[PDB]
Design an enzyme around this catalytic site. Structure first.
Site, PDB file in Angstrom:
ATOM      1  N   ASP A   1      31.739   0.952  14.923  1.00  0.00           N
ATOM      2  CA  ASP A   1      30.762   0.736  13.721  1.00  0.00           C
ATOM      3  C   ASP A   1      29.960   2.095  13.642  1.00  0.00           C
ATOM      4  OD1 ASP A   1      28.782  -0.367  12.290  1.00  0.00           O
ATOM      5  OD2 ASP A   1      27.811  -1.380  13.903  1.00  0.00           O
TER       6      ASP A   1
ATOM      7  N   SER B   1      26.042   9.045  -3.270  1.00  0.00           N
ATOM      8  CA  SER B   1      27.025   8.986  -4.326  1.00  0.00           C
ATOM      9  C   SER B   1      26.615   9.475  -5.753  1.00  0.00           C
ATOM     10  CB  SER B   1      27.509   7.646  -4.371  1.00  0.00           C
ATOM     11  OG  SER B   1      28.505   7.334  -5.465  1.00  0.00           O
TER      12      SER B   1
END
Ligand code: NA
Length: 330
Positions: free
Chosen positions: A35, A199
Site C-alpha cells: 500500500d 499530473s
C-alpha cells in the site's frame, strides 16, 4: 541488495493485489497488500480476536525465534474506505522477494474491521508511503522500504501491476525490460506523507488533451482512480447511459457499453488507461449496471491515482533524498 516479488490480483476485478512476505524464523509467509498510501506493516495474527479471523493466514510471534515484543507500542489505523485495525507491535525479520530487513516493526492486529475479516485473501498490509504516517505510538516506526533503503543498490522500488494478471514489485533496481520507451520523472511532495504529485492533464478516448494540474497521490492500496468531479463527468459523458448513482455510491454504466480510454499526463508524457481497465463489473451479481473505475474524489479531499491508473504504467517510487515518481508506458 535487491528484492523482486510477484503481486497477484485477489479476484477477477483486480480489487487489490497480494504479495507474499516472509515474517519471522522459521519463515511465516503471509500475503500482504502493498500500500503506497499508508505506512504500517500490519498482519492478522495469533492475537487477532478469533471472531474477526475468517480464512486469513496469521502471524504467530511466539513461533518465531527472532520475534521480540516492542514493549509498550500500540497502533491504530483508519483507511480512506472506512476500514480500520489496531493492536500491538513486534520486531522481526521480514523478507520480500529475497530482500531481508531485520528489526522490522510487524504490527500485530488485535482488532480488524469487518471489511478485513470478510476478505480471506489479504493477510495484512505493507505500507510504502512515508514513515511520517506510521501510526505506532509512542515511538513511530519505519516502513519496510525506509529500513531497507540504505542496503539497496538504488533507493527505489517499482510497482508493475497487471491488468487481470500478476505483476511485480521490485526493490533496489529498475528493470529496464519491464517498460517501453523512457521513464518520465515528476516531483513529489511529502508534506502529507504520501507519494503526492501533479499530473499535467487528461484526455478522454481519442479526445484532445486538456492541460490542467491535478494534484494527487500514487496509491497502490486504492482500487480505483479518483479525480475531480469535472474530469470524471467529462469521462462518463462519453458513455451512453452512464450516470452517478447516490444509491450505488458512484458512477455506473450499462454493462453493454464499450468504455473509452483515459489518458493522464506525467510532465510532457502520457499514460493511457485502456477502457477495459475502467470496468469493475456488475454492481451486484447478475445486474446489467456496471461500476465505473473512474470516480469523483469530491468529499475525499485528495485525488487518488489508484490501481486503475497505476496498472497502466511502470511506476518508479524514487526514495532518494529528494523523492520523485517515475512513470513509463509498458
Ligand atoms: Na465497490
Amino acid at each position: 541488495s535487491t528484492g523482486s516479488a510477484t503481486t497477484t490480483p485477489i479476484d477477477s476485478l483486480d480489487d487489490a493485489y497480494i504479495t507474499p512476505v516472509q515474517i519471522g524464523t522459521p519463515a511465516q509467509t503471509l500475503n500482504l497488500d502493498f500500500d503506497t498510501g499508508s505506512s504500517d506493516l500490519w498482519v492478522f495474527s495469533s492475537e487477532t480476536t478469533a471472531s474477526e479471523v475468517d480464512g486469513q493466514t496469521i502471524y504467530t510471534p511466539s513461533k518465531s525465534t527472532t520475534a521480540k515484543l516492542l514493549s509498550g507500542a500500540t497502533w491504530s489505523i483508519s483507511y480512506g474506505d472506512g476500514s480500520s485495525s489496531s493492536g500491538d507491535v513486534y520486531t522481526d525479520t521480514v523478507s520480500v522477494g529475497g530482500l531481508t530487513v531485520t528489526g522490522q516493526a510487524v504490527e500485530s492486529a488485535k482488532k480488524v474491521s469487518s471489511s478485513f475479516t470478510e476478505d480471506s485473501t489479504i493477510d495484512g498490509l505493507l505500507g510504502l508511503a512515508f514513515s511520517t504516517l506510521n501510526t505506532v505510538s509512542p515511538t513511530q516506526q519505519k516502513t519496510f522500504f525506509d529500513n531497507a533503503k540504505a542496503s539497496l543498490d538504488s533507493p527505489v522500488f517499482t510497482a508493475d501491476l497487471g491488468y487481470h494478471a500478476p505483476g511485480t514489485y521490485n526493490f533496489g533496481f529498475i528493470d529496464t525490460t519491464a517498460y517501453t520507451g523512457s521513464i518520465t520523472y515528476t516531483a513529489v511532495s511529502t508534506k502529507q506523507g504520501f507519494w503526492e504529485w501533479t499530473s499535467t492533464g487528461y484526455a478522454v478516448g481519442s479526445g484532445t488533451f486538456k492541460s490542467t494540474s491535478i494534484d494527487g497521490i500514487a496509491d497502490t492500496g486504492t482500487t480505483l482512480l479518483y479525480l475531480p468531479a469535472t474530469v470524471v463527468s467529462a469521462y462518463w459523458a462519453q458513455v451512453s447511459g452512464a450516470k452517478s448513482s447516490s444509491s450505488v455510491g458512484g458512477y455506473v454504466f450499462p454493462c453493454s457499453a464499450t468504455l473509452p480510454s483515459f489518458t493522464f499526463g506525467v510532465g510532457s508524457a502520457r499514460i493511457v488507461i485502456p477502457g477495459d481497465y475502467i470496468d469493475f463489473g456488475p454492481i451486484s451479481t447478475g445486474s446489467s449496471s456496471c461500476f465505473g473505475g473512474i470516480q469523483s474524489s469530491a468529499g475525499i479531499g485528495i485525488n487518488i491515482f489508484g490501481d486503475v491508473a497505476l496498472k497502466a504504467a511502470f511506476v518508479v517510487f524514487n526514495g532518494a533524498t529528494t523523492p520523485t515518481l517515475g512513470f513509463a508506458s509498458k
